[PDB]
């Protein structure tokens, strides 16, 4: 049935002939961009200073909870969120789920000197390029969601392009997975994907299970500077928050709140 | 929840390369010069009382194989056009034909003659393809699309100046591509299935055929007299590949099936 076995091909070189133009104007946007800020060196930088190390999040709605803030300004955020004494931020940038843009991510890093993270959904290298065209400095790989042969490209893609990788990990499973990979920033996420408990002692029993030259990013569940404190004595410094802070109003006070008390 | 994420997330990828193709796609359109009148150049040479040949540049087929080793797709279109050829027509598909996209670009740079894409189109992105290797003319296959792809099909090629031979093997193929607008019919000899080949199926065809449309036999024709037999169906343009191909000198050829 030659027509049929014909279609089958041509559709895979369509998809093919899309896929490598696209991905040829994205390196040349690439090559116009200036040099990552150093995500994760901006963060160890804060912890060698005997500091939290806070990832700040932009994030304008939450599945479940709706819009988080009535007034969404990416630009004034990041300023606050830098006054306030983050060491680096974290934008969501997927629109259907968090109601984030791609243009947010651009928009807040121009706004500070921070670094700044991708966070999104990644399951494809085309996208580590998008997010260095954009202006990201480090991007997300979530364990849960890609295997370890897309893991290790995804993490390979964003290297060659001079940024980090922030690995996601939420049971023991995936910790040894993400301990495959070179990455030193692994995120130790206290909310369970099945059931969305969010429970603290996830995190503490994650860390015990991590080598001491990873560096430990708590999130979800982490609300006040005392948390920070208990996730410290399990080897965990440095924290992504967002919605939490964003909910109040002087975004630079809560910052500084949660990280000196 | 995180396999319902990946479903539109990988939605939005293909939808974000598409766009970036496209729109690089539309630039090279921009800046290739206008297509040379496909059908124009056909009606010309029945308008001289002369056969009207599409002649194609094919090296193989599914159906035969490999037709002509030593394959030199810019001298074969001078040849055609030394032999008579009104247009010519070149296979950019390489897994089944041998064909390449650059044949088709180097095949019209040395020739002055309108150029076809012959390939299988299943996405209007390909018709845009088509115009930036600065083919005049684009195949629709009645077998191989539905009503509303062969529509957007021709619908993009009209708008980008091009011509649209819309090929078809049977009666409800052929009603179907008289909802479309393009006068270029094409009506193939070949059974896909079976790769019988007989002339008799253009002949049948022809009897349905409204006297608006301009048909193409297309398949099975090999000398002069085929042609003249196909005449007397009132088919007076012709698509012929396999033969003139088989053959060392294909000027010469060319010129004793067009003029005996």
Redesign the interface.
């Known amino acids: ?3 049929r076995k ?2 089958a ?3 895979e070189e ?2 093919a ?10 390196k040349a946007r690439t090559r116009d961009q200036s040099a990552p800020r150093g995500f994760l060196k901006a963060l160890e930088a804060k912890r060698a200073a005997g500091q939290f190390a806070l990832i700040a999040e932009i994030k304008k709605a939450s599945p479940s909870k709706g819009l988080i803030r009535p007034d969404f300004d990416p630009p004034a955020l990041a300023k606050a969120y830098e006054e306030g004494g983050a060491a680096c931020l974290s934008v969501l940038t ?1 629109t ?2 968090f109601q984030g843009a791609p243009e947010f991510l651009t928009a807040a890093r121009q706004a500070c000197s921070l670094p700044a993270l991708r966070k999104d ?1 990644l ?2 290298p ?2 580590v390029y ?1 997010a260095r065209s954009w202006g990201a400095d480090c991007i997300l790989i979530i364990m ?2 890609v295997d370890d042969d897309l893991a290790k490209e995804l993490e390979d893609t964003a290297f060659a392009l001079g940024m980090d990788a922030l690995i996601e990990v939420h049971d023991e499973a995936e910790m040894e997975r993400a301990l495959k990979l070179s990455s030193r920033l692994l995120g130790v996420n206290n909310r369970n ?1 099945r059931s969305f408990e969010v429970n603290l002692a996830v995190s503490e029993r994650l860390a015990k299970m991590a080598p001491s030259d990873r560096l430990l990013v708590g999130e979800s569940g982490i609300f006040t500077h005392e948390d920070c404190l208990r996730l410290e004595k399990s080897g965990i410094g440095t924290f992504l928050i967002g919605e939490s802070l964003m909910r109040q109003h002087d975004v630079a006070a809560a910052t500084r709140a949660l990280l000196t008390g």
């Open positions: 049935d030659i027509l014909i279609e091909y041509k559709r369509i998809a002939a899309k896929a490598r133009l696209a991905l040829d104007e994205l997927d259907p789920s959904f399951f494809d085309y996208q998008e849960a969601s994907l």
